[PDB]
């Protein structure tokens, strides 16, 4: 009869260790809990203190995490690896149908279609292979910057959308960035 107690008695401890990983990742110490993740990368000149696992916002809403900081010594520019979740970025099928009608309206306008040649029917055709996947809500010129969270607090990557008429892929490099600003750099211009 005692071997069923080594059947159940193992199972509760197995239920206790396997629950603890569920209670770890949801709070979040290891194993980011955002679904459908995909990694993007960017380059800064100055990240004046920015821990791994920091938050990324779009206009305030948390949309990802930071993986790690890489430095390249022959070019001395920082490089931040970060992951996002597309449930509130990277358009779905109905919001897929508001950009093809916009590329037919704004990109294929009366003056904007014939900017290279007046036969740009491939402009919507080439973009559609990059629209069922590899599509961000982030524009082709939406730049990322480092914020401050009030007046005293941990820095966080804040993305500024707006403008532009094309979009990136799932894994590109944000071509336009902006580095931090330090307290000594404040008092330099002000004095």
């Amino acid at each position: 009869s005692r071997t069923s107690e080594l059947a159940v008695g193992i199972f509760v401890i197995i239920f206790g260790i396997a629950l603890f990983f569920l209670a770890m990742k949801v709070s979040g110490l290891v194993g980011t809990n955002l679904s459908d993740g995909y990694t993007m990368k960017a380059q800064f000149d100055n990240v004046n203190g920015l821990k791994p696992r920091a938050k990324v916002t779009m206009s305030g809403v948390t949309i990802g995490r930071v993986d790690s900081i890489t430095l390249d010594p022959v070019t001395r520019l920082a490089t931040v690896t970060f992951d996002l979740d597309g449930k509130l970025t990277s358009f779905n099928a109905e919001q897929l149908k508001e950009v093809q009608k916009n590329a037919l309206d704004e990109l294929r306008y009366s003056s904007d279609y014939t900017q290279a040649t007046p036969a740009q029917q491939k402009t919507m055709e080439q973009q559609l292979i990059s629209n069922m996947n590899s599509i961000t809500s982030i524009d082709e010129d939406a730049y990322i910057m480092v914020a401050t969270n009030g007046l005293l607090g941990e820095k966080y990557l804040k993305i500024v959308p707006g403008g532009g008429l094309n979009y990136l892929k799932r894994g590109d490099t944000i071509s336009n960035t902006q580095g931090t600003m330090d307290l000594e750099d404040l008092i330099s211009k002000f004095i």
């Binding site: 107690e5 159940v8 008695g9 199972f11 209670a23 949801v26 709070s27 110490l29």
Partner: protein, 256 residues
């Protein structure tokens, strides 16, 4: 390599030792209610609950006063003691009322429960009750369990309330701040459904592990009254490793 085998054979027994205790727990709660159990239960809550009330009230003060002493001594050089009403409250609501009221409950009613059932196995009242067929799990154990699940969250609330009132006593009546400011900051930071109700969900799942480990070691002890006293100090170790260990996880969660 023989003492290795002794250590190996000991923790093999402790695992099985758990797998029995889970089966005893599912056999209690999945049962029809006994006839007239409420009159048994209320008398039981008079034994576990009401008796322990004094030792947690006057221990509610001395945790509060030291929080009202170091909480003042820290906050004076930073000057910003608009947080005294908040740094008495948020520790006492989030950790020390789930934690410290458990280690005092495992002390008195956590260990007096495993004696009372430890005495009942040895004189064979529990054996005599079985031959009459009253199956003592539903007779003796089950009112002694439900008077422990209900009576601990009714204690941490009384612990946290007298703790905060205690911090106000040596704070503003012997050292002196703006009572107004105090109450103000206090109620202007502490949500109810995020903090107090999360301060009770921790005090339920502490009451389950502190009583079910306690009522088990009385039932599955042995006779020979060096067999009681080895078990009444087998809970108080096994409770406090599982109070604090289960606190961490819970806290981290309900506090990412």
């Amino acid at each position: 390599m023989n003492t290795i085998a002794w250590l190996g054979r000991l923790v093999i027994e402790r695992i099985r030792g758990i797998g029995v205790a889970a089966l005893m727990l599912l056999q209690i709660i999945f049962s029809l209610p006994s006839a007239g159990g409420f009159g048994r239960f209320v008398y039981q809550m008079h034994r576990v609950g009401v008796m322990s009330l004094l030792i947690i009230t006057v221990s509610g003060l001395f945790i509060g006063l030291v929080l009202g002493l170091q909480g003042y001594s820290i906050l004076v050089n930073v000057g910003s003691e608009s947080m005294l009403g908040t740094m008495v409250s948020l520790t006492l609501l989030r950790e020390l009322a789930p934690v410290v009221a458990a280690l005092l409950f495992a002390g008195r009613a956590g260990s007096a429960l495993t004696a009372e059932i430890g005495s009942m196995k040895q004189s064979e009242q529990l054996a005599s009750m079985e031959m009459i067929g009253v199956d003592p799990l539903k007779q003796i154990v089950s009112p002694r369990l439900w008077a422990g699940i209900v009576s601990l969250p009714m204690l941490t609330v009384i612990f946290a309330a007298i703790g905060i009132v205690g911090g106000k006593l040596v704070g503003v009546d012997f050292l002196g701040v703006d009572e107004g400011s105090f109450w103000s900051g206090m109620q202007n930071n502490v949500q109810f459904g995020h903090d107090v109700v999360n301060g009770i969900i921790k005090s339920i799942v502490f009451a389950l592990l502190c009583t079910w480990i306690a009522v088990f070691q009385g039932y599955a002890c042995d006779p020979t009254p060096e067999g009681i006293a080895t078990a009444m100090t087998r809970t108080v170790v096994y409770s406090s490793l599982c109070v604090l260990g289960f606190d961490f996880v819970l806290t981290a969660v309900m506090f990412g």
